[PDB]
Symmetry: D2
Subunit: 120 residues, 4 copies
């Protein structure tokens, strides 16, 4: 069974820590991004998400509320466990920036990927 609780790094060097997953699949955690628009401002930020519970290789999603920006990121993906028991989170994300009014809405959403593996 592919589990999400614990510490993970991604391909950009970011670190996240996920706490206990409850019986609904809900989890909280923290996210330390390696990169930002203004990296001098980066602070540890909270995340909240839900995974599927029954599945051995669950899909999941989470939201990161950046504590140093008006932006928000959401990640979704799947936890895969390979034949040797190694886990990988394959994810894609949307990063929503804050714009001044709806005329700027079109430029406010970035997309990308991240692959996560366990810290230890």
């Amino acid at each position: 069974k592919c589990s999400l609780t614990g510490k993970w790094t991604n391909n950009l060097g970011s670190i996240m820590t996920i706490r206990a997953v409850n019986s609904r699949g809900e989890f909280t955690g923290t996210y330390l991004t390696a990169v930002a628009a203004n990296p001098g401002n980066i602070t540890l930020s909270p995340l909240l998400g839900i995974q599927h519970k029954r599945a051995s290789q669950p899909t999941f999603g989470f939201t990161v509320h950046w504590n140093f920006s008006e932006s928000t990121t959401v990640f979704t993906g799947q936890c895969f466990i390979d034949r040797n028991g190694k886990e990988v989170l394959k994810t894609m994300w949307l990063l929503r920036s804050s714009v001044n009014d709806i005329s700027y809405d079109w430029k406010a959403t970035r997309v990308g990927y991240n692959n996560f593996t366990r810290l230890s």
Copy 2:
């Protein structure tokens, strides 16, 4: 100030309720999608997210754990208010399907938009 708490509909005819937003910007709710891969199977599904608390037109994200599928959707966007006080959530989403192993990961993520308005 653009508020997320309440009842919303989107351009596909889906509806959602969002409950009270706490001091950290966290919220729960319930999502009824109008569409699915198998629409005959649709059940009400929980959502969990975070918005920015201080901003007049906050960015936010939330995860929907579909209760009738192994998939998960994340939404992110911004709440805008026009001159007459009418709110719109401008959002982008990623829908993650469950695939068998990492070699199928490439086809597992759909993307789209949704615009939400308040019901009454």
Copy 3:
């Protein structure tokens, strides 16, 4: 049969012309965006794409080489025709900005939607 050749406008107020589609489904045209990072700089920009030729409601893609920026957009979508013969292009796009090196790549891709209808 839903045809791409002609003059189109989208929900942001941008317009494009698409020229004749050849036997391979290839087409050129000209795009006038209503919006940019720097709207004072906007110039007409060429597009180049391919549609499926046989399909009544073809999928397609095209690239816009912005003539006033180092960025590029790609659009993909499908041409639908309703019962009265009215066409709509339902599209999704990626806007790639130029960044200095690979360490900035994560923030270089925006995503969004556009719905196009025929001008007259």
Copy 4:
């Protein structure tokens, strides 16, 4: 200067071949995908795109008209050259499937990434 003409592989094992880039930045080529919904049907497929010409690390886009499917993919990205002259294409893509009518449009667009390096 980061050039696109030549043969490339990506992280999924796909191969593409780009021909001469003209003075406008337009190029054609072929794409042999390693993966598909129905891999038994895969055939070499044409692509058409545009890159920026002046830039040492140009952004670009291209469309692949799959010759074995009603779907279309668009790719956009940037060509980076590192301190040793090694080139990488960092891309993201949208894959548009053909659906029967507009009520299914919401599920028709997949998103993902690909990193390309030169075959030789």
